[PDB]
């Protein structure tokens, strides 16, 4: 199958540089132009540039918003694509995607990666505190019961929250983070049958890639 995977995102100081990478597999890489597209949190997609295919000698073109400041390159031995960013500013904070572009015929971006989030800020990385949200005994009498995890005090985004290593997936609400005092806080809830808890365990697994944090917090009756 076709695969595109961005890496390299994270926290970078204003005026600093950062290079992203995009690893591909599952198609003939040199046959395709490749594009980079970014999306500031909550905002629209912006096309940034492309690098052409072999037939057109791998040349590059850039949107006006980044020409002269960003560089795209590719490694045709490894089927990899790069985006070098310089003189970063707050407007550059965004999720960056690589997308498979033109093959000399088709006009479509048929495939996109999952994206990698770049945050441009002077604030320091701070790992999260993860606290269990165990339901009051008053709230365990119904058919369904709701448990949670509070993920408080971290920077930059993102964090991921799964429940039981991802095997509990329905009935989950993970709430967008709120930023205050240059720290983010978010929470996640999961609602399960009262049958299942506390008889079978429920654990939230939180990761914060900027501080390589990995936490499991088992929700125990209080």
């Amino acid at each position: 199958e076709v695969k595109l995977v961005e890496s390299g995102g994270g926290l970078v100081q204003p005026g600093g540089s950062l290079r992203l990478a995009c690893a591909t597999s599952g198609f003939t890489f040199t046959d395709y132009y490749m594009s980079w597209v970014r999306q500031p949190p909550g905002k629209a997609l912006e096309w940034l540039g492309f690098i052409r295919n072999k037939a057109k000698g791998y040349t590059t073109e850039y949107s006006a918003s980044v020409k002269g400041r960003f560089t795209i390159s590719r490694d045709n031995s490894q089927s990899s694509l790069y985006l070098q960013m310089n003189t970063l500013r707050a407007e550059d904070s965004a999720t960056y995607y690589c997308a498979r572009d033109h093959d000399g015929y088709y006009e479509r971006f048929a495939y996109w990666g999952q994206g990698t989030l770049v945050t441009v800020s002077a604030a320091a990385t701070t790992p999260p505190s993860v606290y269990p949200l165990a339901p009051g005994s008053a709230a365990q009498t119904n058919s369904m019961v709701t448990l949670g995890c509070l993920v408080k005090g971290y920077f930059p985004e993102p964090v991921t929250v799964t429940w039981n290593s991802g095997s509990l997936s329905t009935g989950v609400h993970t709430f967008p983070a709120v930023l205050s005092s240059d720290l983010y806080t978010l929470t996640s809830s999961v609602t399960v049958p009262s049958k299942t808890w506390p008889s079978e365990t429920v654990t939230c697994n939180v990761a914060h890639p900027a501080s390589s944090t990995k936490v499991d917090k088992k929700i125990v009756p209080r």
Binding site: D101, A134, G136, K152, H173, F175, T185, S189
Partner: protein, 219 residues
Amino acid sequence: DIVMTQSPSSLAVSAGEKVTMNCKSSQSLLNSRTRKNYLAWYQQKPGQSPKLLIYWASTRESGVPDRFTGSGSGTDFALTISSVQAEDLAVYYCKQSYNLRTFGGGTKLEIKRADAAPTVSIFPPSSEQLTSGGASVVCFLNNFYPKDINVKWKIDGSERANGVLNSWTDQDSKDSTYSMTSTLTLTKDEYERHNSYTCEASHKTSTSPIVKSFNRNEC
């Protein structure tokens, strides 16, 4: 220098209804050589990467449901969904590739459904947090519609507005509800001077606020 604009910026449609969204370019996208308009549509569901739906204005990508149809020519294009499903909740972008590439600003499609009352759950600060000096009280207002909702916190029967932060989720792709979290953060010392902690939810589905609370003495 090709400017792309989309209309409407957002709208809400009930399952089963038709949806039309529009995309305008400052310049014709009809390529004389190939006689095709270089205009694609992408669907971006909440928290996901954009996915291709339509390209060359009207060609539906394999695997895209038949309910999506692209149309238009030159400077004016549309994406029409014949019969909306809950899963179609997303932002829809058009994109020209006649000269480099440029995305329109997107149309956000929300799903209208029947009003629904929230399920409210309240949680005390954990002993881990308290040991470290902080006290966050959390209230979840889950699976309600429409999005507007008000939360009131009371400490020993009196209202408190300081230190309350709220966060709504995007609409759910399966039931078209919203959920919201309200977190009240106090110091440990202030938390320990009071007993009754109450989260009150007021939503158009009832003239009666939904009330959840706990007492510190009870744990």
